[PDB]
Design a protein around this ligand. Structure first.
Ligand SMILES: COc1ccc(F)cc1C(=O)NCc1ccc(-c2nn([C@@H](C)C(F)(F)F)c(N)c2C(N)=O)cc1
Length: 263
């Protein structure tokens, strides 16, 4: 789990975000990696490091792999699989003038496969959204930052009443009671399918976060993006039953997606 910084070569800065700067590099001069330099005070570092091996054990081809951490210096580095096309949210917005509708369904299948694997381990993602998915050089979408919100220090992001909480991806039981489960990841997946089929538009864009939480509590839901067929919309809408126990599992969604692909 501990990577020696001597084996890393840094090659290009890719960007910066909430948890720090990301660079593309090589491990032992040969293997592509992404390196995130964790922003001081953003994470519970000791707790993350003791559990980095847990996340390293979650190996599925549609999860962005965590390769290890460098912790004998400041800042700590988190080393992962390199995803050359970057965030899914930005990639969807760039796809707007060049795509086949068939590719949108294959992106949903990729994310669903990763989430069926996490569900099989009873591992909660807690912030599934297009901004937390990445895209590789072959256009395969993979899920990233799985479970990370448990280690974030800023209550503005982790509390349901924080200005930065992912209200637009959350079901009623999370907004009201902070009750997370595999079924709150199912709700967020349906919003992510809506983001894919809307080519990266913001969900509930006419509403503030406070108005969105009221809108969802009143039973109102996202309408059908024009690119989604009625069979595709039926799948995303199934993720949004008010009662969590009425929402499907990721194994059922995957079979439904594969049925639409087949037909
Ligand atoms: C699998 O990782 C985890 C799993 C569980 C967990 F709890 C935490 C982590 C974690 O912290 N990973 C650190 C990390 C996250 C994202 C990128 C990354 N980001 N980006 C872009 C948006 C940009 F712009 F930031 F560069 C890539 N292309 C990236 C790329 N990998 O090519 C790089 C490293």
């Amino acid at each position: 789990w501990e990577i020696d910084p001597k084996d890393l070569t840094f090659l290009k800065e890719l960007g910066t975000g909430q948890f720090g700067v990301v660079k593309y590099g090589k491990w032992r001069g040969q293997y592509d990696v992404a390196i995130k330099m964790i922003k001081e005070g953003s994470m519970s570092e000791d707790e993350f490091i003791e559990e980095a091996k847990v996340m390293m054990n979650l190996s599925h081809e549609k999860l962005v792999q965590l390769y290890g951490v460098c912790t004998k210096q400041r800042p700590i580095f988190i080393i992962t699989e390199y995803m050359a096309n970057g965030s899914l949210l930005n990639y969807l917005r760039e796809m707007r003038h060049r795509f086949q509708t068939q590719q949108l369904l294959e992106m949903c299948k990729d994310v669903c496969e990763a989430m069926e694997y996490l569900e099989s381990k009873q591992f909660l993602h807690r912030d599934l959204a297009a901004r937390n998915c990445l895209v590789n050089d072959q256009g395969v979408v993979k899920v990233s930052d799985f479970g990370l919100s448990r280690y974030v220090l800023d209550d503005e992001y982790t509390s349901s009443v924080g200005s930065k909480f992912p209200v637009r991806w959350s079901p009623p039981e999370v907004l009201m009671y902070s009750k997370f489960s595999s079924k709150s990841d199912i709700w967020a997946f349906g919003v992510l399918m809506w983001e894919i089929y809307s080519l990266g538009k913001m969900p509930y864009e006419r509403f503030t976060n406070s108005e969105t939480a009221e809108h969802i509590a009143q039973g109102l839901r996202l309408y059908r993006p024009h690119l989604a067929s009625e069979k595709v919309y039926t799948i995303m809408y199934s993720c949004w039953h008010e009662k969590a126990d009425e929402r499907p599992t990721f194994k059922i969604l995957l079979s439904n997606i594969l049925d639409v692909m087949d037909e």
